[PDB]
Amino acid sequence: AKTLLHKYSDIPEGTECHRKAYASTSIGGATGLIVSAYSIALKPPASFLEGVARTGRYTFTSAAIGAIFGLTSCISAQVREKPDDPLNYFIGGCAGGLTLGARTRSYGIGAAACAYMGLTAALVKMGQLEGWQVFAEPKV
Amino acid sequence: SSLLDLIWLETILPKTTSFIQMKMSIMVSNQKGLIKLYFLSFLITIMISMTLFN
Amino acid sequence: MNIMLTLLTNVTLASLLVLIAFWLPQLNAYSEKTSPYECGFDPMGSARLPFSMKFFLVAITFLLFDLEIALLLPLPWASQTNNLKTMLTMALFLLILLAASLAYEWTQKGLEWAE
Amino acid sequence: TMYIAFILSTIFVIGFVGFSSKPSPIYGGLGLIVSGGVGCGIVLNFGGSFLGLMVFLIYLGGMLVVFGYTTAMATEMYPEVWVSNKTVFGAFVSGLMMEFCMVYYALKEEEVEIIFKFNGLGDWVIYDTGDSGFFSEEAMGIAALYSYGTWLVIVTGWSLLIGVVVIMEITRGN
Amino acid sequence: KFYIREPPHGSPDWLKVGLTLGTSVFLWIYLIKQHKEDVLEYKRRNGLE
Amino acid sequence: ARQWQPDVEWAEQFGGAVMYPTKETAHWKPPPWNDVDPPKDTLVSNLTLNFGPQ
Amino acid sequence: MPLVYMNIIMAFAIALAGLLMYRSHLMSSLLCLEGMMLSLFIMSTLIILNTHFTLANMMPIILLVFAACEAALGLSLLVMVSNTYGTDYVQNLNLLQC
Amino acid sequence: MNPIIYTTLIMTVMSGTMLVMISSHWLLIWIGFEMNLLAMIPVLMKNFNPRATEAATKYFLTQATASMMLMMAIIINLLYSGQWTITKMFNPVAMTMMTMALAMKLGLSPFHFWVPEVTQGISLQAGLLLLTWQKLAPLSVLCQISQSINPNLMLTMAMLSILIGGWGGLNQTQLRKIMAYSSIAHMGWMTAVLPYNTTMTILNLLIYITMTLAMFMLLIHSSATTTLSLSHTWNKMPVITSLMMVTLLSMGGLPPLSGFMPKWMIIQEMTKNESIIMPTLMAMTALLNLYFYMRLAYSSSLTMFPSTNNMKMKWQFEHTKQMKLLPTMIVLSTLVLPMTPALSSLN
Amino acid sequence: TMMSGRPGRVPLQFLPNEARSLPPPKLTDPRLVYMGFLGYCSGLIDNAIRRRPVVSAGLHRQLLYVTSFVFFGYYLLKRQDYMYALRDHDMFAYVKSHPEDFPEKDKKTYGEILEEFHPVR
């Protein structure tokens, strides 16, 4: 987890779009694997083949979302020549939301996911820029 | 009155949020109460905590 | 080392006796000879069906009292201490609590088998 | 060296793999008895004869009750054994393969697990040169439960008495 | 006699009433004395009066 | 000409096994009033033994 | 750390994974629970005997005592469940839901 | 159960918790946990029925697993330090095991399912004792070992607890399961503040215990275990419904009630440590708890549901047993906001 | 735990000896009056729950409620004041002992400080 995030962040912002897409795809695949493992544990499938099918579907959905987000964000940053701009991450997040909507075959899910993932990704970019921290170290 | 106030402004914030919360509530609370299932969940949690937390 | 050799010798002798028993004599086996024994007639049920245990509570009490005696076993070495009064007090305390457990179960009818 | 402690530890892990693959409580108890005896051997080699014999005796007594309970409560028409079931055999083989892999890696190189760092060397190496005289340190430390450890005796005896009360109360019914 | 059955709290429980009043009075006088002692000790320690 | 107060339809919408029923949760049923489930007609199945003739 | 400690910790992990993965019987999970405390006993006594912590030699005995209390508690619950349902299967403990 | 045996079992539960709280030795802390569990099982099984037996079985399995993991952590810590004293743990793996075990004992997510299941299984008195006291002990251990807690693991489990509690409570319609999910959310808040100010953890614990005692005792007084059962209480004793409504408003965190004080202090304390996203998400997620508290308040006090015909006989009769300290719990859970700076006395 | 384990702390002591040098709360403290008000509210709620006349019945019981709340509030206020005095004492001592960490800065007037002007139009 931390190693994957370190790789993704160590690739520079506006360069190496293929490596950025690979790293984001790996992160998405790991997230999908975790979600699928919890789904298998909590809602058991009727068969081993059904379990494998569900795991593959969730993993591919997450990996596709990650790949689309990373590729779109890096390409947008490259073409605009404006790294460190939250708009690139917003575009990547909405592209990932559209990918989720396509995977689920639902326009409403696609639209809501585009909005929410775009806001989340833009906020993550702003946090990287401004030094925001979620799990802050204790002090004071 | 109709398209914006009664339909779209209602759909964007309060209706969509309520629908998402209801769906997540159903997902969380829809359990059969099987110790086998949620102990397997415990095992997955323990492995994840040991590996991905350093 | 010597104890391992002794255990190996005993196990090997017993296994050799089993091997001689199962390979020396003439064998004739058929389905009627190897059928289960129930006094000349066929068994109605199976021997793997549940078998009620009328002393299930005495077994649990046995677990607890067995670990009580595990606590009591190191007493011979405890008698070499300088704190003889404290040692004697704690030994008698453990034994009195064991007696209290026995008395409680006896009066509350835990020692009676289920009917 | 003779690797006696390592061999015994491997047998200990094998018995755990057995009763954790969980064929049926009869064979689970058999594997647990084997593991208890082997652990008695391990701690006998390390020095504690009283502790080894005590844990062996306690588990022999405990598994005797489990046999009677599985005859009454946890039995079926065809009790499962390790080769009888696909799941049980799969889990048993998985555990054996994992133990073999880790043993081989540790013997071939100083294996650092994702949790702890282990060095492949002598259990005889790790021992201490010094000796006692005319008494057993383990026996004296255990016998110190009555001179020292007055508080431990009190809480332990209270817990045992309340345990008798509890088992009587749980099985009351009505 | 309105009630066919004697109410549990028909008559005051004089023991409880006396204990209540005594406890309240004791707490009040103890609080007054404690405050007076606290003021005196504070003044003595700080060298005021 | 008076304030509206809930009726049987309202109460019954609040009286299910769970809020927001689904297929599974509609197959679910609310627990008994005194929390005591009716006894199950399990079979004792006493052991049958041939005592004799040999 | 010697390989003996590695094997004992591995045995504990195996017994923990056995408990968390029920099959049908409650008794098998109880046996997995008893194995975990056996591995804890062995690990504790190996650590204590190696370091000559003399006063800590009584700790494994207390560990065994409370293992016995847990086993007694579990067997009592098992007999109650079996009386109610006819079998010690864990599938019958489904009246309560999350 | 004999009254003497019941009171000796209650005293044994309390003695185990007190041993945990006063011990300085990890073995004695483990002994206290074991004694607490052993005496706590019959209390759950006090009223014998299959649901109580199942709840006691699930509680025993979960607590035995947690105690085993805790002892493994203790032994691993002893291996790398030779120390039995409860201080900062010297091994990160042992600390992770200890955190997992204590979280499983407390019911923090993803170790929460047993909380609603067991609480629905057991009676109202048993649920009251369970929630209150069995949260009281592990939190004291966590406060003792707070300086080595992994902030990431602790805060992840806390946010999971808040989210899961809100959502489960949204779905539930049984009062005991509602209480259990509310408990999960409040434990989330306390353990979220835990790595920064154990004083704020203690303050939240006390306020939560007061509100939970008042709520459970009101349910016991009204003999209501479902929403529709509680909907008949306005026609028997309308005062109890009003007090319950004010207590529910307090639990939801509305100012100026006593439920606002812990959330306020925790948000402030976390903000001092440069945490903003976490307090904002935690504050926004509590709206779910407030929603299902308000849904419960609509049915019982703010609207008048249909009643039955035997309520007339119930009118003719009077409640006999008197709840101990119910008025005090009602007042402390609603009206002590102007007394906030006493948390320094709590320090 | 900030002040837990502060040197010289006696365990399980609600009020130490060094707290006697602080001014005790006045008996007419507004916080004490609010504690008495909480006691009175508890008494009224007791009467209401037990279905006695709320304001009239149980005057002795209501007096006991108010008195208990005032008593405990007095001692709680003393402990709270002591803890705050202790905190200020420690903070001042640390600032005195670490001058390099808490330096006095030269004061500049607004005639010397330059601030950017942002017109509102």
Ligand SMILES: CCCCCCCCCCCCCCCCCC(=O)OC[C@H](COP(=O)([O-])OCC[N+](C)(C)C)OC(=O)CCCCCCCCCCCCCCCCC
């Ligand atoms: C006291 C405890 C330990 C006991 C150890 C052994 C004690 C007995 C020692 C003397 C045994 C004498 C041989 C008896 C063999 C069985 C007879 C039998 O089956 O006959 C029918 C069968 C008849 O065979 P058949 O071919 O005619 O029959 C065909 C089958 N039917 C019947 C259907 C037609 O006899 C044989 O097969 C003869 C086999 C060879 C006999 C001699 C070999 C053994 C020699 C033993 C020497 C001692 C050392 C080795 C033995 C082990 C001890 C160390």
Ligand SMILES: CCCCCCCCCCCCCCCCC[C@@H](O)O[C@H](CO[C@H](O)CCCCCCCCCCCCCCC)COP(=O)(O)OCC[N+](C)(C)C
């Ligand atoms: C008859 C008159 C009325 C009596 C009513 C009594 C009801 C209350 C019972 C008294 C409770 C306090 C017991 C007083 C004697 C015990 C002394 C000891 O416990 O006091 C200190 C500790 O006491 C308590 O911690 C603080 C007592 C104050 C708690 C009540 C106020 C809580 C704040 C709530 C603010 C808003 C509500 C305002 C009140 C209405 C000791 O410190 P220490 O041993 O080292 O603590 C170690 C653990 N730490 C460090 C982590 C804390």
